[PDB]
Amino acid sequence: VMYYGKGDVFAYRTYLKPLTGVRTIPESPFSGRDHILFGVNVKISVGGTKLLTSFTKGDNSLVVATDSMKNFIQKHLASYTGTTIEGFLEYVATSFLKKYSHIEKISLIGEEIPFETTFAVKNGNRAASELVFKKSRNEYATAYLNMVRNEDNTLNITEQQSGLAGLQLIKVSGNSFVGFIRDEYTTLPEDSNRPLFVYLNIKWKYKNTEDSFGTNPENYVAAEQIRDIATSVFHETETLSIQHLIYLIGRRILERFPQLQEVYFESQNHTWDKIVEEIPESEGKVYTEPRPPYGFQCFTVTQE
Amino acid sequence: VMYYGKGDVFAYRTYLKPLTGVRTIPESPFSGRDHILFGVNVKISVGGTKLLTSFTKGDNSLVVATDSMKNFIQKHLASYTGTTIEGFLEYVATSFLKKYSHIEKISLIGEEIPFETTFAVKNGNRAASELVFKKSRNEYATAYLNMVRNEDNTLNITEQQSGLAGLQLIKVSGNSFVGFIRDEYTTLPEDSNRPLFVYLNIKWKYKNTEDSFGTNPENYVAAEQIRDIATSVFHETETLSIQHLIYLIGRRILERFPQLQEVYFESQNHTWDKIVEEIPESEGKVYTEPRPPYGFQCFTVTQE
Amino acid sequence: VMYYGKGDVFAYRTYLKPLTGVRTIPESPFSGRDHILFGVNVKISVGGTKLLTSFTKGDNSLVVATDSMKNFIQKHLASYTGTTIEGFLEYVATSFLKKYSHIEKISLIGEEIPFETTFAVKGNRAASELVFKKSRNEYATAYLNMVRNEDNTLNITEQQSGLAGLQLIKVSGNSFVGFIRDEYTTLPEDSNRPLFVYLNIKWKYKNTEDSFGTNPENYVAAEQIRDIATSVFHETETLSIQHLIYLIGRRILERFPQLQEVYFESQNHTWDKIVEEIPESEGKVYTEPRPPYGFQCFTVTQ
Amino acid sequence: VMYYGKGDVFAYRTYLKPLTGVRTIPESPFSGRDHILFGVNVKISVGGTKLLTSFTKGDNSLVVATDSMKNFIQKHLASYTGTTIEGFLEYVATSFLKKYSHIEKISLIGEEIPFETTFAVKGNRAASELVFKKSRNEYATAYLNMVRNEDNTLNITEQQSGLAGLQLIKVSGNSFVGFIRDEYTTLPEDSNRPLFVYLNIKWKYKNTEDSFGTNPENYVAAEQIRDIATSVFHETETLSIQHLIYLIGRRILERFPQLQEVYFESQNHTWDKIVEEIPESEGKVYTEPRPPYGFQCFTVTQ
Ligand SMILES: O=c1[nH]c(=O)c2nn[nH]c2[nH]1
Ligand SMILES: O=c1[nH]c(=O)c2nn[nH]c2[nH]1
Ligand SMILES: O=c1[nH]c(=O)c2nn[nH]c2[nH]1
Ligand SMILES: O=c1[nH]c(=O)c2nn[nH]c2[nH]1
């Protein structure tokens, strides 16, 4: 292994070209992105056999300073004329390999820094502000791209993946976990109605990488729409386990987006412990935080 | 000083009585709370001279175990028939002093664990789910209460405060910071148009503590409404500093809510560093995260 | 309330004047600080009635920029000729009030950023004078409040030193029994628990000048306080955290008669026991509890 | 991809069999572990084609509950008769595959929860056998993957030990010069910087059984790796982080010929210099940089 790079390259751009012309799905009102504020946290990794002596000999002649990579990324956000994080990464990657001919491979991660709208009164009505936004620490979109330089100096994308990270959903009823193995290691009671709390990280891969860029936006798959599929399927489903749930979410995603090749889930179980089961004259209960150990699932659904 | 207690007492209640009948303000659509899910993180502190020997002699005869306080809090959330965190704290406090006659003082903090609604398709339309909610790590409501037992065994509230914590707002334009002291310690340039980014913690105190409880809900001041005042005033104001902004927010709060005695602000400055000032054929710019040192302000506005 | 300031002012200085000549105590090997690397995280807050219109009118005429406060602190760390965080806070506070006549009050917090020695071979193995390890464990703290009086004199109104983030577990020799059992009590009595405490310990001096280090025989080092706490924890068959922190405070006040008080903020993080008995062993297995934690706050006075 | 499991399985055992008889090296005083307190945080992941219908149909018939995996790990820590996290992972993995015939693959991570000795007076000052300090600094790690073959035999396919979270700063004797200067370069060359690195160091054995501790002469302790890194950092006039980690890896492989490779994940956290020159002193003042950090990933092979 031989790579080096720069992480936590925060970059905030105002007035990026808006994303419009997307194709809708029943589960989601998503219709585009205004891009008054477009925030991204980028990580860049680069490799190439010509870098060996920077490790073995202390020779920095072919070292692009990691600080310079930060400058590169931030200056390219200013010149980017596209509309997606996925497209931004392609722009940075192609540009970097063109600039630095001794680099053979580049890997990029971009994570959305999401902002929400806020209310303001002006001119007699209350409406969403075009100026004031709220920083969100909830779920966020992600993108990943790897690009290589070939022997003939052409550049190729070798892997692309988009995602939604940090979605935390609790369904208060309509979930069971029963029928699992009861042996000398089992102390978990069967539960026919639990308040399932899942953390979800959902990643998708396109059949055609061009569709990830937003250039023909009707082919773009938006993290917002993926979120809304997840919440809809969770609601609709009498869940039998998290495994059961995430397969159903993945199937719905692939049905709604035939341009996707596969969808990958990282889920965690954070369901609360029950403290009070019955409340007089109420359907309510009281729960509390569990001990730290958490269940998790890793699972891919493919169009095949 | 002599106190002991329990922190991080998480408690989640389903189907609390809903909060309705509130009085509206222009800056906010807030009209109540459904309370399908009501989450609170409670901290309890207790004191009393009768506790001295638990420290000086190792005598636990009068020690309520901190673990038992956790049970007390969680069981009282199940029996609580009110509609606010402020009212819950009063219920816990009164109940605890009634149970434990050698305790002279109790202090409670309750912090909302907020959940947001999600979309689901069912029966032919998409609508907000009554079952699936999204855990939010953004701003949250707070409450504080201190209660004492007097010589005649009556109980009195000695301080009450409500709040909104963790509000993070960025206004992209329409802010200046100019005209400050320029001396041998000054390297900050004057800026006539900066993207001010503030973190805000806003706390209010009522003229009449009864108004905090929700029993006559038209007198309750909701953290949601306070949030919306903050965003509205930020939008409306050509800010001259954070100090300037927070005074204006506080004045608007006291004007909208004449039942409040005062409002207290803890603000922090997290404004980004500018990297690209001019983008061809655009009003956009690029910014990045600053170094760690952050400005802060602490400021009270009173009805007087 | 009306103040403003700057937080997370990190400042790292190399080769501060060494802290030497400290009175050593039985519990601790501490005898000074080399100060090859001196790291502090400073928070400054200032007030004055003349600041009112910066809030009420947007008038920045009398605003020292918080960014400039950052520069002030970092440049004063470069010119500081003393040997403690406590003395550094006094230097900053006096300098700031002397510079800015419209400021009536200043409050400072300084938190050590601690670095530990590491081994190098140079031959034989010894502590390096160049390579240090950044520690995210316990750290020293200092607090100072200073005011300008009506007669233009300056006065320290509050001073407090401390040790923060000490996390100690004693595997045996601790009990928690005899507490109230009623409808809300589910906790079992335990005659031998592995008490795990977090400790924040703060102390005040009878004479504020003893905090500065200028006469090092009267300086109380956070390193010595740590080693008193572990020594007392070891020696004591504890009956509660309450019981332990009282005895730690008594020992501190006995070792350091120049101190007026010691204040504790403790938390309980004791593990849940999962396996009570292991064939042919003294040992047991435990695991992390649910999040709710007990805490205690207590002052011992000289 | 199809697996599931349990993370943050904390398990604390008292009086594990001590690790003794380790080969000591010049760079490190390490000679074993008392194991009065042994803490590990375990993550388990399992797979098998027979798990498919638990996803596709909601059939829990063949689901070992993740909660039960937690119980499995904690109870096996109570019955473990060995002396390392690496050997504990092997015990859990073999036991789990022997118990659950429908599981084809298991992957384990174990992370040390480290505890440091403290002083007590008992008389004279000495290390306590009862009171320990929880450390949030560097910690040992272990990784193991085991599979069931077509012929029902079990095989370790992957094993890796490590040291995580080592944060080291060298105040002088580091340079970063000679790198590419073009339209995107603003970083100044620096012939004497206080290089601050975070290090995660991982190693693989030629023979997986040397990882278990069963013959302690062949065991490579994370404590020894730490002290090699600080020793090499001290000795080296570094020319980059790249240059440093290569030399640390070379030294590790020379000291431990039983190792097949060492892998590094490094990050740069060097401070920004604020004051270049201090009257009549060697010293300087620095402060924390903006968030973006450099990193390096590199493998050295025996
Ligand atoms: O949904 C669940 N899947 C699981 O595998 C599991 N194990 N314990 N609880 C669980 N819940
Ligand atoms: O709004 C601000 N207030 C301040 O006091 C300040 N100081 N630096 N920047 C600042 N911005
Ligand atoms: O030392 C303790 N003090 C307490 O007050 C307490 N309550 N539960 N456990 C406890 N342990
Ligand atoms: O050691 C370093 N290696 C690098 O690649 C680098 N880039 N900026 N600073 C650096 N320091």
Structural account:
The structure is a homotetramer. With 304 residues, chain A is an alpha+beta fold. Chain A has one domain (1-304). The first copy, chain A, has five helices and twelve strands. Chain A has helices spanning 52-56, 66-79, 85-99, 223-236, 242-256, and strands at 2-14, 37-47, 105-113, 115-122, 125-135, 140-149, 155-171, 197-206, 260-269, 273-276, 286-288, 294-302. In chain A, the strands form three sheets. Chain A has an eight-stranded antiparallel sheet with strand order 1-2-3-6-7-8-9-12. A two-stranded antiparallel sheet of chain A has the order 4-5. In chain A, strand 6 (140-149) and strand 7 (155-171) form a beta hairpin. The longest helix of chain A has 15 residues, at 85-99. In chain A, 49% of the residues are buried. Chains in contact: A-B, A-C, A-D, B-C, B-D, C-D. One 8-azaxanthine (AZA) sits between chains A (177, 188, 241-243, 269, 295) and D (4, 63, 65-67). Chains C, D: The active site is at residues 6, 17, 66.
